[PDB]
């Protein structure tokens, strides 16, 4: 998964001939084309040129063409930092997420996720885990990939996990909670539905929809207390917390629907009289090492198809750029 | 006739300074969150809309973190949650976001409205783009969120005319005259209108 | 006079002396003053109870169906007045203050009760 692109549609091999054109067209307050941004990004052979692109993609993110940041312009940047470091300044676009604004929601996310653990990368694979959690993804077998990895640091870091990183824990499992294949893909939702429900009565209902894509209905224990019956029509975290709330600011709900602190007796007996059906019909970190070779047939077929859709792109846009120099 | 050579040339020079050094959205749609005023204007927001700016979040500061700036995504207003459980929302087709603005928001966009389930073609501009009453629909539970399912008598004195005109013209016709409602449409006060009917100050 | 985006309104006008009101409904432009010039003249409204107690109104309701027929906006007190008669239905704010004074007489039935 390296030398598929790197026959790279050969071109000019300079930077100072082009680093004084983009800002010159920035200081004239003119827009900048989406073709002239790429020709610095392919010219990366150093880390001094990495912060050259950080001084340029910042100003092109804040350009009147806030669109036309094309997906391969991200990906041709994904090659260079995987080439050089893939440790710190490769990440430092994705943390701010708006002063550069890539969003490469593809197989391009996974190429810097699998190249993480090749150094075993325990710290810098906590972040992109959280930063593709917020972005719209998970129509891909990378649903297996993050779920294999959130249960690497569920086994590693063991605290109250934060004020708001407890909410970051559950939010990274439900959007990969799309797994009709196995019961642990449904027993992964019971993990996240639990500790998203623990912030319901300590920290507020608004804490689940700050920035992260979750909805405003106040029941997430009851989104867990209904689907485990569907698994029972076909989990040791919820045992602590459901008694924990029963142990010892703007109001936006209604005076007839109850504030759900008063449904904790109907939260115990609705759950505790139901887990016996799993005992009547019929640990996790090993179950993700089963799917690693079961599925994951490595969808490179649409990757190289995207490489041919991009060869449809860059030669036709350059065919435009040649017209605006001869007609003048 | 004495022509106004000055008052003619003084009109383009306002029309080329409401066009050249106009301030954009970025410098007049920020809000102080500690005094509740505005930069460059100073005019405080009414006390009915204090929490929505202070404690909730805008549209394009929610839409500043998505690929293609939400090329077809769904957006719901904060009030539309609290007034109608019926699905009222937009879709999107185009965005024209600002560039001077740090921490991108305040831009321009347009898309497709669906009011409490009643959809419409002819994509127009969104209302309240700078307003902080906005929430995003996540694509987990996206399909069931969008799940949807005479004539009046006259006031008495105008009633007293038509019955007398019948008695004048020839027929008794003790049929009551019934003016209709069924042409007059009843869109609510919560319906967002078109944007470029308004002008930006 | 050229008024930037003017519409037509059916307003009331003062024409009496001090402490003697006398109203008179007029078809006019929106931005001309209350006492000022009208487009066309309509009936008078007498707010003072005359001999043996009547509050008199005149309404030529042939030309107001020519003027509200031609899309004239109204004034709120005249909006109540055709509901007090029956050319229009009754205004909601006239219904509320009818109920409010009733509810302000429904606090009188406990102030009368708690003394005797």
């Amino acid at each position: 998964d390296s030398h598929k692109w790197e026959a790279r549609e050969k071109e000019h091999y300079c930077l100072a001939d082009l680093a004084s054109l983009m800002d010159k067209t920035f200081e004239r307050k003119l827009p900048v084309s989406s073709l002239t941004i790429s020709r610095l990004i392919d010219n990366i052979s150093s880390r001094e040129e990495i912060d050259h692109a950080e001084y340029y993609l910042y100003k092109f993110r804040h350009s009147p063409n806030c669109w036309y940041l094309r997906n391969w312009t991200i990906h041709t940047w994904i090659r260079q930092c995987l080439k050089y470091d893939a440790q710190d300044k490769a990440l430092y676009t994705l943390v701010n997420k708006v002063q550069y604004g890539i969003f490469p929601d593809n197989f391009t996310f996974n190429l810097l996720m699998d190249s993480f653990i090749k150094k075993e990368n325990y710290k810098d694979a906590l972040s992109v885990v959280f930063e593709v959690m917020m972005q719209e993804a998970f129509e891909v077998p990378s649903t297996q990939l993050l779920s294999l990895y959130v249960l690497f640091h569920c086994l590693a870091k063991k605290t109250d996990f934060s004020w708001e990183e407890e909410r970051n824990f559950g939010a990274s499992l439900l959007l990969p909670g799309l797994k009709q294949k196995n019961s642990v893909g449904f027993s992964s939702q019971l993990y996240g539905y639990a500790l998203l429900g623990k912030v319901e009565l300590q920290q507020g209902l608004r804490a689940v929809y700050h920035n992260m894509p979750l909805i405003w209905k106040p029941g997430y224990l009851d989104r867990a207390l209904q689907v485990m019956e569907k698994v029972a029509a076909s989990e040791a975290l919820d045992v602590l917390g459901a008694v924990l709330k029963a142990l010892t600011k703007l109001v936006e709900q209604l005076d007839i629907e109850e504030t759900e602190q008063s449904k904790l007796p109907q939260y115990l007996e609705r759950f505790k009289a139901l887990h016996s059906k799993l005992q009547a019909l019929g640990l996790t970190t090993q179950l993700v090492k089963e799917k690693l070779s079961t599925c994951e047939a490595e969808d490179i077929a649409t990757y190289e198809q995207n490489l041919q859709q991009w060869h449809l792109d860059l030669v036709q846009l350059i065919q435009r750029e040649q017209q605006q120099r001869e007609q003048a | 006739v004495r022509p106004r050579l000055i008052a003619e040339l003084a009109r383009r020079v306002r029309a080329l300074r409401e066009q050249l050094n106009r301030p954009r959205d970025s410098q007049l749609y920020a809000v102080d969150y500690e005094t509740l005023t505005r930069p460059f204007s100073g005019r405080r927001l009414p006390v009915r809309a204090w929490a929505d700016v202070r404690r909730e979040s805008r549209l394009l500061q929610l839409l500043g973190r998505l690929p293609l700036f939400g090329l077809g995504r769904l957006v719901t207003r904060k009030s539309w949650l609290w007034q109608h459980d019926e699905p009222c929302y937009w879709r999107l087709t185009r965005v024209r976001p600002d560039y001077t603005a740090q921490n991108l928001d305040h831009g321009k966009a347009w898309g497709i409205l669906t009011f409490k389930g009643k959809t419409e073609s002819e994509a127009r501009e969104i209302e309240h783009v700078m307003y902080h009453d906005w929430r995003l629909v996540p694509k987990h539970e996206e399909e069931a969120f969008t799940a949807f399912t005479a004539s009046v008598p006259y006031p008495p004195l105008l009633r007293a005319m038509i019955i007398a005109e019948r008695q004048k013209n020839g027929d008794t016709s003790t049929e009551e005259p019934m003016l209709n409602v069924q042409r007059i449409r009843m869109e609510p006060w919560d319906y967002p209108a078109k944007q470029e009917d308004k002008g930006r100050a | 006079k050229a008024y930037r985006g003017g519409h037509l309104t059916i307003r009331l006008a003062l024409g009496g002396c001090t402490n003697r009101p006398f109203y008179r409904i007029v078809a006019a432009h929106n931005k001309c003053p209350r006492d000022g010039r009208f487009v066309e003249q309509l009936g008078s409204y007498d707010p003072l109870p005359n001999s043996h107690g009547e509050k008199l109104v005149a309404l030529n309701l042939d030309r107001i169906r020519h003027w509200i027929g031609c899309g004239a906006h109204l004034s709120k007190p005249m909006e109540k007045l055709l509901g007090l008669a029956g050319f229009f239905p009754l205004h909601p704010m006239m219904i509320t203050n009818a109920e409010r004074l009733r509810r302000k007489r429904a606090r009188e039935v406990l102030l009368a009760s708690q003394k005797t």
């Binding site: 703007l250 109001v251 709900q253 209604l254 005076d255 007839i256 | 609290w82 | 109920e99 509810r103 429904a106």
Partner: peptide
């Protein structure tokens, strides 16, 4: 009104509310 919409206004103005009665009466002497 149905009592759910009566509470719906009570959702909006929690800092500024008065209390009230139901029906207005029939007559007054």
């Amino acid at each position: 009104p149905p009592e759910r919409e009566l509470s719906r206004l009570r959702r909006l103005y929690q800092g500024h509310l008065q209390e009230e009665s139901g029906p207005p009466p029939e007559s007054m002497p």
